[PDB]
Design an enzyme around this catalytic site. Structure first.
Site, mmCIF file in Angstrom:
data_model
loop_
_atom_site.group_PDB
_atom_site.id
_atom_site.type_symbol
_atom_site.label_atom_id
_atom_site.label_comp_id
_atom_site.label_asym_id
_atom_site.label_seq_id
_atom_site.Cartn_x
_atom_site.Cartn_y
_atom_site.Cartn_z
ATOM 1 N N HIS A 40 105.242 12.467 72.178
ATOM 2 C CA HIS A 40 106.073 11.472 72.891
ATOM 3 C C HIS A 40 105.435 10.809 74.127
ATOM 4 C CE1 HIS A 40 107.826 14.563 75.856
ATOM 5 N NE2 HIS A 40 107.889 13.418 76.599
ATOM 6 N N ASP A 84 106.269 17.816 68.485
ATOM 7 C CA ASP A 84 105.930 17.004 69.666
ATOM 8 C C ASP A 84 104.612 17.422 70.357
ATOM 9 O OD1 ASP A 84 106.149 15.027 71.729
ATOM 10 O OD2 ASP A 84 107.543 16.129 72.879
ATOM 11 N N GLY A 175 108.016 13.218 83.917
ATOM 12 C CA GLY A 175 106.627 13.093 84.350
ATOM 13 C C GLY A 175 105.845 14.368 84.110
ATOM 14 N N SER A 177 106.106 15.976 81.297
ATOM 15 C CA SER A 177 105.887 16.032 79.797
ATOM 16 C C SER A 177 104.420 16.102 79.384
ATOM 17 C CB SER A 177 106.374 14.718 79.162
ATOM 18 O OG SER A 177 107.777 14.756 79.091
ATOM 19 N N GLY A 178 104.133 16.720 78.277
ATOM 20 C CA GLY A 178 102.754 16.886 77.768
ATOM 21 C C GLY A 178 101.987 17.958 78.537
#
Ligand SMILES: [Ca+2]
Length: 223
Positions: A40, A84, A175, A177-178
């Site tokens: 994402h 994801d 922010g 994320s990942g």
């Protein structure tokens, strides 16, 4: 990160920032030329930033390397966030030291009750907006799959896990994320989704990296 502490410069040496004119997502350095992130976060035109602490100041330890190729998991579903996970190859290999290092991929899946470290530059508030410029850390347990499914009825798959506090107050946020969730020195999670941040009974939901190891290794071997 809501509810966490300031990690301290280059204490999380595998943490990257994905930059496209601005910081948009985190990631993890898994060897000198590969980064693992959230599907994402996919964009074109990513630059990878290594060695960062203050993303708004050049402090000396940084390596900024463009991505050559980005691979989203073949089965990624953007409506469910199932699978994801994404691979980014660097145009050039990073120079690995004490302050820029890779994180090991897991051999086993970590169990509920294990304490992990989550880090990133995301929003630090549960209500309203305040982005830190320096890297923020949270220690948090992996919750049981029962407690997870019961917070997020119908939405949790086998490739997810929950981690954090059902009481709220402490979580990952926009922010983050990942970014990494590292337990016992291995990469176990990727910050993926949640309902708001740090709310009561709505823990963070993370991609279960141990399910993807064979995929990661095969892709890296061939690309
Ligand atoms: Ca910097």
């Amino acid at each position: 990160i809501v509810g966490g502490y300031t990690c301290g410069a280059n204490t999380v040496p595998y943490q990257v920032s994905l930059n496209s004119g601005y910081h948009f997502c985190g990631g993890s350095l898994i060897n000198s030329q590969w980064v693992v992130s959230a599907a994402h976060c996919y964009k074109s035109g990513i630059q990878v930033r290594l060695g960062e602490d203050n993303i708004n100041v050049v402090e000396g330890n940084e390596q900024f390397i463009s991505a050559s190729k980005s691979i989203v998991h073949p089965s990624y579903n953007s409506n469910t966030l199932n699978n994801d996970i994404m691979l980014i190859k660097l145009k050039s290999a990073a120079s690995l030291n004490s302050r820029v290092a890779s994180i090991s991929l897991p051999t086993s899946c970590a169990s509920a009750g294990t304490q992990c470290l989550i880090s990133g530059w995301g929003n630090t508030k549960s209500s309203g907006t305040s982005y830190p410029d320096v890297l923020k850390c949270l220690k948090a347990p992996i919750l049981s799959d029962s407690s997870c499914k019961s917070a997020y009825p119908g939405q949790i798959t086998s490739n997810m896990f929950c981690a954090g506090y059902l009481e709220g107050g402490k979580d990952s946020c926009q922010g983050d994320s990942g970014g990494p969730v590292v337990c016992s020195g291995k990469l176990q999670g990727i910050v993926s989704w949640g309902s708001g941040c740090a709310q009561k009974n709505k823990p963070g939901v993370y991609t279960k990296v141990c399910n993807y190891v064979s995929w990661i290794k095969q892709t890296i071997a061939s690309n």
